[PDB]
Amino acid sequence: SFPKYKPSRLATLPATLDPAEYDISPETRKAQAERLAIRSRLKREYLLQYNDPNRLGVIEDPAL
Amino acid sequence: TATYAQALQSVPETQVSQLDNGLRVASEQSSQPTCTVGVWIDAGSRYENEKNNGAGYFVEHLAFKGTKNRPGSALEKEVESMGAHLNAYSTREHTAYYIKALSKDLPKAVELLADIVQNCSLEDSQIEKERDVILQELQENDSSMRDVVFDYLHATAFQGTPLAQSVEGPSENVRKLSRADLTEYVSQHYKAPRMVLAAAGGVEHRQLLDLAQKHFSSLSGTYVEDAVPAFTPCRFTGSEIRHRDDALPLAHVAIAVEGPGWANPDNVPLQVANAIIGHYDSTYGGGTHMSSTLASVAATRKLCQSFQTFNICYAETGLLGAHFVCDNMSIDDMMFFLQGQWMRLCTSATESEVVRGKNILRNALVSHLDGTTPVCEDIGRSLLTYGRRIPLAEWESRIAEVDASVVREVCSKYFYDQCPAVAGLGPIEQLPDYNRIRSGMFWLRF
Amino acid sequence: GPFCAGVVGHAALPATSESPVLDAKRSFL
Amino acid sequence: QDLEFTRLPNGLVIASLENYAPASRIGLFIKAGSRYEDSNNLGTSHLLRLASSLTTKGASSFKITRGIEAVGGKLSVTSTRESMAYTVECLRDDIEILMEFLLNVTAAPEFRRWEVAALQSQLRIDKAVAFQNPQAQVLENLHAAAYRNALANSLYCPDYRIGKVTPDQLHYYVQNHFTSARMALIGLGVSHPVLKQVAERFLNMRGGLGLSGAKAKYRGGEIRDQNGDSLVHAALVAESAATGSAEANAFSVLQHVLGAGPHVKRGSNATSSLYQAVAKGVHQPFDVSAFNASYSDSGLFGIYTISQAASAGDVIKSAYDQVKTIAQGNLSNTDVQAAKNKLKAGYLMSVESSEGFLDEVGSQALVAGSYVQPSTVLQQIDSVADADVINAAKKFVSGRKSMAASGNLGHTPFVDEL
């Protein structure tokens, strides 16, 4: 029983010591799949614009 | 001239074997011509989330309503034609399907159990019919006061935790449930490592194992897309839920404190303590002369129609307390006497009552494990919870180790100065406010 | 289904037994 | 070991099976009950069943209760119309103490006036608890309507006799009906010689047959309660064979043919012929089963139905018509075989548990003296032919019928209409 690690605002709790990383449910996996889908769609669009030989200029990021 | 110890030694021993898929096949063999073979599944409401709560009850309802191999009438016809009795019970932590049948009919019973567990049709028309039936059964279960007060106890004690959910589930979930949700529940929770095939009576362990290899082998423990349900410890919250309905004739109150898990060794001394507290109903003949002080006072003053002490244990937490039905104007007195008995056991328990409690526990253990159905139930539940069927000799040794010092220690740990969880139903106005109830949990003298 | 109208008891359990009296699927229906 | 049966000279029957189990169960079965009550002492059997813990010559009420509780034992009194059974269950080591308590209760009761007066309220409490389920009252009225004599007496004390049961009546009932020729001491997990010793020790006195009840006479009446309950419980029965007769086995097979109890939870009772026959006519919540009661003098067979008040007539008529169809010869050999299997399995499952085995041994000892092995009982079941089942159905249809109904009863048919 080693002393536990008190997370703080400037010392976040590691994913390894996350009590929720070891309590997984089918819906959590579904949400992870959805997030991966979102990231994949965004990365696809960005790379499509980024590898275009015709493009000349900045790739306007709406998020920025 | 066999002695109790010799009789325990002569008890047939449970043999546990595991199929490669993870199904555990367990058997206790007796000379009886009748056998009870059942599949115990480690699935229940505690493994269900909010939206799919009650799916286990739905699946239990429609499991005997047909399979892909044999349609709905066919399963019932086979079971009745061989004379077998097919029954299922679903709890917050366990779900089981067991068949009482003749020993010569073991192969067919195993086939039917495998078909029910694996190849369940879940047909949509039957789904709608069972939906209607389950809504009606919820309305009926509203009438059963004991079940309601225990559900309230679980809701208030384990609030914010899956254990709070009822086995049947909210009516809204029942009407919103679909075939996809039931299929997903079966796929997620009915897995070979989480299932136990248990039998009792005239069953040969080799034959049972071979039948299991023949039929249950296809069932697999792999989770689709590695979506593995993860067990969650449940927090115990000291709370009070009062459904004040003065129209009801008698008041039901259930008060409990957090208890040990299934595997915790302190269960045995606590069971001895509860046996010391005892149980009373108005129909008991013993009355005033009954050893239990609470029972004696209740009989003398007609305080309560019935009072019983319960030790409900789950994997990591449990509800330890008592449930008593009493008149509207006797609730406060009965609560006072119950808490007084709790504190007396905690502080000044004596050897004689400890011996009485141990003897009562021994008799309950030996008497309950009588017949193929209870023996098979104990085998399955013990494999699921303890990971092993604790032999009666081990139970006797653990009971014998209990002494007054042990009872005082464990009762002080679990009952003294601990916030209780209280659920009340009916004319419960005289039920003391929670501050008074908590104050009763400790003695200013001690 | 005799449904012997049993009474809960300890140290005195009065049980009275009648003959098959149905009440089999009333909850189901 | 094997069951050992001994008929003592005083007429007592002692049976013991050493199961080598942790728990030992000893039961004294006495041929007394509501049947042997006359009109004057009605309900005495009920209070006698309740008065199992009252002060005895050997021990006081306090000693009996405290000792039985201290060893963790249980003392139970089980009463039928023709039988009363006193049983003690505990660990084998402490069986002697509970045996002494049991024989003190059975053979030397004191029935002190104050204790009986105190216990008289338990008569009403028990009656109310038992009558919560409508089945109890319906069957009480069914027995009252069917027979004009001994078997009509209720298992529960009549309301007018609640406070009127006297200690003298209890003493008279015990002396004249608790007798050695009427008793059988059945033990599980106890050696035969020990049981024999205890039987000589206490059960030597009060020998002889004792007072004999009159033969039950069929009355063919109807009792309709009109209690206003939503569902209507109605039972229509006709006289049948006494227990331990060929026609009795035929009637049991007929009961299983028609449908006795569902085997699959929340099922449709597909094998049960009555259930389907009613179900096709009535789509409302309903229930139906075959009522087979066998006693030493005579028996009753018939149909018990629970249905919506409005549809009670349809359900009763459909069940009666299905029995009529069986009587006319529309009975398949396969149905008979399936019913035989169900009955044999039911017998085996009943004798599986210790309580069931003790009860069966006691019932056989009291009714027939000797103990018949389960194999012979199964052979008797097999011996029943389809023609016997048809003849049993014909006897039920043709015979005069008695009916008890409880509920709204607005549409419940009278016996003449059926």
Dist. CA D33–CA D51, nearest whole Å: 14
Contact B281 C27 (CB under 8 A): no
Cβ-Cβ contacts under 8 Å between B and C: the total is: 28
Dist. CA D202–CA B437, nearest whole Å: 52
Of C12, C14, C28, the CB nearest to B133: C28
The Cα of C3 is separated from the nearest Cα of chain D by a number of Å equal to: 8
Of D52, D135, D284, the CB nearest to C12: D52
Contact B286 C7 (CB under 8 A): no
The set of residues, in sequence order, having a beta carbon less than 8 Å from that of B434 and lying 6+ positions away, is B240, B422
Dist. CA C3–CA D233, nearest whole Å: 14
The Cα of D268 is separated from the nearest Cα of chain B by a number of Å equal to: 8
Instruction: Kindly state whether B281 is in contact with chain A, defined as any CB-CB distance less than 8 angstroms.
Output: no
The sign of the dihedral angle between the CA atoms of C18, C21, C26, C28 is positive
Tokens read off for D154: 């209720």
Q: Which residues of D touch C29 (CB under 8 A)?
A: 284-287
The Cα of D9 is separated from the nearest Cα of chain C by a number of Å equal to: 31
Contact D69 B356 (CB under 8 A): yes
Do the beta carbons of residue B320 and residue B256 sit within 8 Å? yes
Tokens 């526990």 correspond to: B361
Is B402 exposed, middle or buried, given 0-12, 13-18 or 19+ CB atoms closer than 10 A?
A: buried
Instruction: Kindly state whether B77 is in contact with chain D, defined as any CB-CB distance less than 8 angstroms.
Output: yes
Of B49, B184, B230, the CB nearest to A24: B230
The Cα of B140 is separated from the nearest Cα of chain D by a number of Å equal to: 13
Which helix (H) or strand (E) is B97 found in, with range?
strand B95-102
In 3D space, the residue among B199, B217, B196 whose CA is nearest the CA of residue B208 turns out to be B199
Q: Which pairing describes strands D84-91 and C13-16: parallel, antiparallel, or unpaired?
A: unpaired
Tokens 């006494």 correspond to: D242
DSSP letters, B309-373, are EEEEE-SS-EEEEEEEEE-TTSHHHHHHHHHHHHHHHHHH--HHHHHHHHHHHHHHHHHHS-SHH
Contact D306 C15 (CB under 8 A): no
Tokens 């003053």 correspond to: B301
How far is CA D358 from each of CA B196, D25, D173, D331, D351, rounded to the nearest angstrom?
A: 32, 8, 25, 36, 8
Contact C27 B286 (CB under 8 A): no
Cβ-Cβ contacts under 8 Å between B and D: the total is: 141
Do the beta carbons of residue B152 and residue B239 sit within 8 Å? no
What technique determined this structure? cryo-EM
The Cα of A11 is separated from the nearest Cα of chain B by a number of Å equal to: 26
In 3D space, the residue among D188, D193, D192, D195 whose CA is nearest the CA of residue D22 turns out to be D188
Q: Which residues of B touch C27 (CB under 8 A)?
A: 137, 140
Dist. CA D331–CA D149, nearest whole Å: 35
Contact B49 A25 (CB under 8 A): yes
Residue B356: closest C-alpha in chain D: D70
Tokens read off for B30: 């007796």
Among A23, A28, A34, A36, most B C-beta atoms within 10 A, so best to mutate, is A23
Touching status, chains C and A (3+ beta-carbon pairs under 8 Å)? no
Classified as helix, coil or strand, B332 is helix
Neighbours of B31 (CB within 10 A): 9
Dist. CA D137–CA B69, nearest whole Å: 45
Of C9, C27, C28, the CB nearest to B285: C9
Residues 361-380 of B with CB under 8 A from D: 361-364, 366-367, 370-372
Do the beta carbons of residue D251 and residue D241 sit within 8 Å? yes
Contact B184 A26 (CB under 8 A): yes
Dist. CA B439–CA B416, nearest whole Å: 10
Tokens 């003695």 correspond to: B443
Touching status, chains B and D (3+ beta-carbon pairs under 8 Å)? yes
Classified as helix, coil or strand, C3 is coil
Residues 134-163 of D with CB under 8 A from C: 135-136, 138-139, 155-156
**Of B48, B60, B258, B377, which residue is the catalytic one?**
B60
The set of residues, in sequence order, having a beta carbon less than 8 Å from that of B423 and lying 6+ positions away, is B149, B150, B152, B153, B155, B156, B240, B241, B242, B253, B254, B255
Tokens read off for B84: 């077998």
Among C4, C13, C25, C27, most D C-beta atoms within 10 A, so best to mutate, is C25
The sign of the dihedral angle between the CA atoms of D396, D397, D400, D402 is positive
Do the beta carbons of residue D66 and residue B295 sit within 8 Å? no
Contact B363 D73 (CB under 8 A): yes
Total number of residues shown for chain A: 64
The sign of the dihedral angle between the CA atoms of B365, B366, B367, B371 is positive
Contact A29 B188 (CB under 8 A): no
Classified as helix, coil or strand, C23 is coil
Q: What are phi and psi of D384, to 5 degrees?
A: -60, 130
Beta bridge partners of D23: D91
Q: Which pairing describes strands B34-41 and B195-201: parallel, antiparallel, or unpaired?
A: antiparallel
Query: Among this protein's residues, is B60 annotated catalytic?
Result: yes
The set of residues, in sequence order, having a beta carbon less than 8 Å from that of D303 and lying 6+ positions away, is D235, D236, D237, D258, D274, D288, D289, D290, D291, D316, D319, D320, D323
